[PDB]
Structure formats: C-alpha cells, structure tokens
Design a protein around this ligand. Structure first.
Ligand SMILES: [Fe+3]
Length: 270
C-alpha cells in the first residue's frame, strides 16, 4: 500500500556509543574489542567505524542464487508461526524487486522510514509483506578469520525486513559488517536488562507466550522500544551505514530492521 507520514511512530531513544579505531587499534581485533569492552558493554550494543586504511563481481551477482523467507511486517507484534518460504533470487533480481518496493511504498530519510516501520508493527493499517535472504587484512575484521583466534553467515534484506529480538546463542557476541546497501537500524538492551525485556514482554503480550512458551528463542517477535521504554527498559539505537560494524555484547538483546536493499555478514564469538 503506502507510507503515512503523520502516523509515524518513531521511538525516542539514546544513541548507542560509537567507536572510531585507529590503524593500530585496528590491527588486532580481539584486542580492540577488549579495548572498548568496558565503555561499550553497559549498553549491550555499539557501532565501530573503521579507519581510512580499511578496504573490503559479475556472476556472484548475476548467477549466484539464494532463498528468501516471507515476513508479515504488520504482524510482527500484534497478532491473535514463522516466516514461510519465499522465492529464490540472485542479488541482481532481489535488488530489482527490493528497490521497486521502496519506490512504490513511498526519497525518505532514516527517520522517515524508522517512524514508518514502527507504525506498521504497532499500528498497521494494511498487510505489508517483505522478503529476506538469511544464513547464506589478515585481521579478524575480515569475519572469516575470527573462528581461529563457528562460521560467518550472510544476509540480504530490503526496506522493512527485520531481524527480531533475541540474545546470541550462548554468551557470544555477534560482530556485524554491512558490506553494501542501505542502513540497518539496530536496537540494543544491556545484559543486566535482559530480565526487564522478557519480563516486560510477558507483561504486555501474555497471550502469545501462552501458546508459544518459547518465543524468545523464536526470533519471530518484534517488541517496540517505545513500549520497553515504558516499563523502564534501556533501549539504545544505532544506525549501521555501508562499511561499519555493529557489536552486540554477550547476553545482550538485539533487534533492528533494514532501510532498503542491503547485504551483510556476521559471526558469533567470545
Ligand atoms: Fe543476532
């Protein structure tokens, strides 16, 4: 259907802390992270922008296929049991589909979208369905390298494809590198506030725990940060542009959604 600019319900949050490593700090990954750990860990999430030194094909694009999964944005929070299969795409065709979608639904800002996005999930006025791929130097910032010093997985998403609220598998971190595409919005709740997050979600959404006692391990539910905030939970926002990492700390709760066609990669680690 279409964008509604006055029904925009954009959440008022504080900004996640942003870190700007230097060329040395950036030569050892595990170290630099240990470096900032103390200052970043109290938020649950942080955004690390690489120095200038850093630097990251016509067939992986046009030929390399992958499958998608269908998401009912408008029923990610309010509904009375997962994302069914979607079509298969190449990067090429998935972009053509993703970009049409944005062109038609609405060029908007990150705030224009964000506030639309939440509108859709808190207060939908029509069904809206989206698609997403998922689970497809020398320094561990080249994610494939970390497992040494567990494997790096890849995502494609479009405007409004979201990754819901979870906490990493064990007590892992999750390091994430936006390769190319539009901004990914994040939302992070600090570990010591895990209780408040699920305690708050049982509170306002009893029903669904009823019939799915294990939602929190489902990754199919998107709680609104405005409403967490209501029950005194600390949600920190942050926007991951092309070529910046996001770092979820252990036991830390994390959701967000893409602002348009983008393509990412993450790895767990402790
Ligand atoms: Fe994650």
């Amino acid at each position: 259907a279409k964008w509604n600019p006055a029904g925009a319900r954009r959440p008022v949050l504080d900004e996640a802390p942003v870190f700007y490593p230097t060329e040395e700090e950036f030569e050892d990954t595990l170290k630099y992270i240990e470096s900032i750990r103390p200052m970043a860990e109290p938020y649950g999430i942080c955004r690390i922008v690489p120095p200038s030194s850093w630097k990251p094909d016509k067939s992986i694009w046009e030929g390399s296929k992958f499958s998608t999964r269908v998401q009912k944005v408008d029923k990610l929070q309010n509904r009375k049991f997962g994302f069914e299969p979607g079509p298969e795409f190449t990067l090429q065709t998935f972009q053509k589909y993703a970009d049409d979608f944005s062109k038609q639904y609405f060029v908007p800002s990150v705030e224009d979208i964000e506030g639309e996005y939440w509108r859709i999930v808190e207060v939908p006025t029509e069904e809206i369905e989206v698609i997403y791929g998922a689970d497809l130097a020398q320094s561990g910032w080249n994610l494939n390298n970390l497992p040494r010093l567990l494997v790096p997985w890849v995502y494609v998403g479009m405007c409004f494809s979201s990754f819901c609220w979870h906490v990493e598998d064990h007590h892992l971190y999750s390091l994430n590198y936006m390769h190319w595409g539009a901004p990914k919005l994040w939302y992070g709740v600090p570990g010591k506030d895990a209780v408040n997050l699920e305690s708050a979600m049982r509170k306002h959404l009893p029903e669904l725990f009823e019939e799915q006692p294990d939602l929190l391990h489902n990754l199919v539910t998107q709680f609104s940060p405005s409403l967490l905030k209501s029950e005194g939970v600390h949600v920190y926002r942050c926007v991951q542009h092309e070529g910046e990492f996001v770092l979820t700390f252990p036991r830390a709760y994390h959701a967000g959604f893409n602002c348009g066609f983008n393509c990412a990669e993450a790895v767990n680690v402790a």
